[PDB]
Swiss-Prot record:
Domain of life: Eukaryota
UniProt name for this protein: tRNA wybutosine-synthesizing protein 4
Organism in which the protein naturally occurs: Saccharomyces cerevisiae (strain ATCC 204508 / S288c) (Baker's yeast)
GO cellular component, one term: cytoplasm
Pfam families xrefs: Kelch_4, LCM
Pathway this chain belongs to: tRNA modification; wybutosine-tRNA(Phe) biosynthesis
Length: 680
């Protein structure tokens, strides 16, 4: 077949520029996410509720991606679509709207929207038109496919004919609802010409200029011109979706992101000039657009109605939320207008960023690198006698092995202990490893394999015998919970991802668990990956930060409590609850430097990124004062620091060991290790 031969020909060409591209990742979401979502959020559905496909026209292959890249790319389709929606809903129903996709690549967006078969874009069927702009070469191929693929030609009005061929191979296409126009965006003057050739000057036509990760590869000056050129088109919106480096090119995630693109020889340039959200506002004001509504991907995520999140969480197993936080904060969605009639209704409005607080430098303790390349995340570790023991974790795969850590001032020695029993705990992460039996044994509680495979089998490891014994098992599975040995030798167990009680108590000698959820409205929800320590001296303990099972909320509370050992119905009671934005951490670890100073370390936050001043801090529980333990510019810039999956070990010094993150397919990073010593 003549047509089919042509189709395949340029079908292959389209591929040489689709994989590890945003289109490939959208095909991924199209395969997995869109079929499992209800009307509101599938974007593509026929009258009979059958999902419709479009990204398959440029990337047919079954594409797959981690659960973090997928949620991100769902957020990303929902980014553009929520904004286009606000414009279509408000603009009077007779006005012509024009969507101009700047550097569209193989983005099938127009066809997703123009297709009368898709009842989830009915508001686009009549009065919306589309202009695709990219490099000449690219549009040639893309037009070949639009012509030779009947389903596509059908949409925009071209003839569907098995027995017709258009061999011209041009870089431009003209239809009532879709045109493609070639243009090198780095040429501000050819672009400005194009704006008029297309009659975008007409004030009776509303313009929507969309820059989805394209003006991000261009130098600030080259991209600022594109933006400004459009500001002079009366009644225009500009939608820009691109990267941010809110805390500089040395933020743990930022460092990896820039470096990744450098390797792909597609550096991020504009972001260098425009680091933060506010930076984008002033930019758009300066360049013509006086009305701006902007926030990062995570504000967009909180923005989803609870009916939508519930579906999303149930799409695929997911448990990389520290990665999701970081990624989200490094991508901005910026909606700009050059006319004041258009209002950003509260449905779409982004709350302004609340100012950050400066903190007093800690006069007593400081940070100083201490290599501990255990090369693994999300295990746990506790001290026994003078020995240290790290168990399980992933690296990047889940292991069950136990490591003895010989801690030294400069470096840490590691020996793999050998198991002596025929039975062993399955390989797991996000469990807890706690010391019991007067420092003779170690208690393994909960944990998981894959995120849908929470575990309920607990174990005990005996140092002398080097044997594993499966003790009693948790009624409900449980991971990402917290733990800490109590004075009496028992083990408190906090929240986690579980259906079980919010707080458990494991009596070692009696070999039983006990639901001891405090009588407080705070504990109505299972707290995930919070910080939790107890101080035998001050006879109390703290709960710090932590997230909830909606994967959206994060406690900003520091909870002080006591332990009444002689009480068997309310052993745990809440003394006091403290609040502060810097408490709002997920995946942190806390520890007592002294009875009057609690070391709070690492984790991610829904609010913003942690910097060198507040990644590590300390709080005085009775004084209610916050002191900051700064990280040197050196350790920030030169060494690999990623506070997620790490742990705290103590033998007046607390080491920050293990930890990493895969940084959204921009490569992996490993927390090299740090130590907190007293100041000379």
């Amino acid at each position: 077949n003549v047509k089919q031969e042509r189709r395949k020909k340029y079908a292959d060409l389209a591929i040489q520029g689709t994989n590890n591209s945003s289109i490939a990742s959208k095909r991924s979401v199209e395969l997995l996410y869109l079929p499992k979502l209800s009307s509101a959020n599938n974007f593509q559905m026929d009258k009979n509720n059958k999902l419709l496909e479009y990204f398959k026209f440029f990337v047919p292959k079954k594409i797959k991606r981690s659960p973090c890249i997928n949620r991100g790319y769902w957020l990303r389709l929902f980014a553009i679509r929520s904004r286009l929606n606000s414009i279509i809903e408000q603009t009077p129903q007779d006005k012509k709207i024009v969507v101009v996709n700047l550097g569209c690549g193989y983005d099938p967006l127009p066809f997703q929207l123009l297709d009368t078969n898709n009842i989830q874009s009915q508001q686009y069927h009549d009065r919306v038109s589309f202009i695709d702009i990219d490099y000449s070469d690219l549009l040639k191929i893309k037009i070949e496919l639009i012509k030779t693929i009947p389903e596509l030609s059908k949409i925009i009005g071209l003839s569907e004919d098995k027995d017709y061929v258009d061999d011209s191979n041009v870089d431009f296409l003209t239809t009532p609802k879709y045109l493609a126009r070639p243009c090198d965006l780095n040429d501000s003057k050819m672009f400005s010409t194009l704006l008029n050739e297309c009659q975008l000057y007409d004030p009776n036509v509303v313009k929507v200029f969309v820059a989805e990760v394209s003006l991000a590869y261009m130098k600030p000056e080259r991209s600022d011109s594109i933006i400004e050129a459009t500001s002079k088109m009366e009644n225009s919106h500009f939608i820009i979706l691109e990267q941010l480096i809110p805390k500089g090119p040395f933020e743990p995630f930022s460092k990896q992101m820039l470096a990744h693109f450098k390797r792909n020889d597609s550096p991020l340039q504009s972001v260098l000039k425009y680091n933060t959200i506010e930076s984008q506002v002033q930019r758009f004001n300066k360049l013509g657009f006086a009305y701006v509504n902007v926030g990062d991907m995570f504000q967009l995520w909180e923005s989803a109605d609870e009916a939508t999140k519930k579906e999303l969480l149930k799409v695929e197993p997911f448990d990389e939320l520290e990665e999701f936080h970081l990624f989200c904060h490094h991508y901005v969605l910026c909606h700009a207008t050059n006319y004041k009639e258009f209002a950003f209704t509260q449905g779409f409005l982004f709350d302004r960023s609340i100012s950050e607080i400066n903190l007093t430098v800690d006069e007593d303790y400081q940070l100083l690198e201490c290599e501990c390349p255990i090369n693994r995340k999300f295990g746990d570790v506790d001290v026994a006698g003078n020995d240290v023991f790290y168990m399980g974790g992933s690296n990047p795969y889940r292991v069950n092995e136990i490591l003895q850590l010989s801690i030294h001032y400069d470096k840490i020695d590691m020996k793999n202990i050998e198991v002596s029993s025929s039975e062993v705990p399955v390989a797991r992460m996000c469990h807890t490893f706690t010391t019991i039996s007067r420092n003779n044994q170690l208690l393994l509680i909960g944990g998981r394999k894959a995120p849908h495979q929470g575990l309920s089998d607990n174990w005990i490891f005996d140092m002398k015998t080097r044997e594993w014994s499966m003790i009693k098992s948790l009624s409900h599975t449980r991971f990402r919970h917290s733990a800490c040995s109590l004075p009496d030798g028992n083990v408190l167990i906090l929240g986690g991802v579980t259906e079980g009680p919010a707080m458990l108590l494991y009596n070692v000698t009696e070999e039983i668990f006990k639901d001891v959820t405090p009588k407080d409205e705070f504990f109505q929800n299972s707290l995930v990956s919070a910080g939790l320590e107890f101080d035998p001296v001050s006879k109390q303990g703290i709960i710090l930060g932590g997230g909830f099972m909606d994967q959206t909320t994060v406690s900003d509370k520091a909870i002080i409590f006591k332990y009444d050992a002689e009480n068997a119905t309310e052993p745990i009671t809440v003394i006091k609850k403290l609040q502060h934005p810097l408490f709002q951490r997920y995946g942190s670890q806390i520890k007592y430097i002294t009875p009057r100073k609690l070391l709070i370390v690492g984790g991610t936050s829904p609010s913003g990124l942690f910097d060198r001043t507040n990644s590590i801090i300390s709080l005085d529980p009775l004084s209610e004062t916050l002191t900051s333990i700064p990280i040197s510019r050196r350790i920030w810039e030169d060494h690999s620091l990623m506070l997620a999956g790490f742990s705290l070990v103590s033998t007046g010094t607390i080491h920050i060991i293990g930890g990493g993150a895969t940084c959204y397919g921009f490569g992996s990073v490993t927390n090299v290790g740090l130590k907190l010593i007293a100041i000379a």
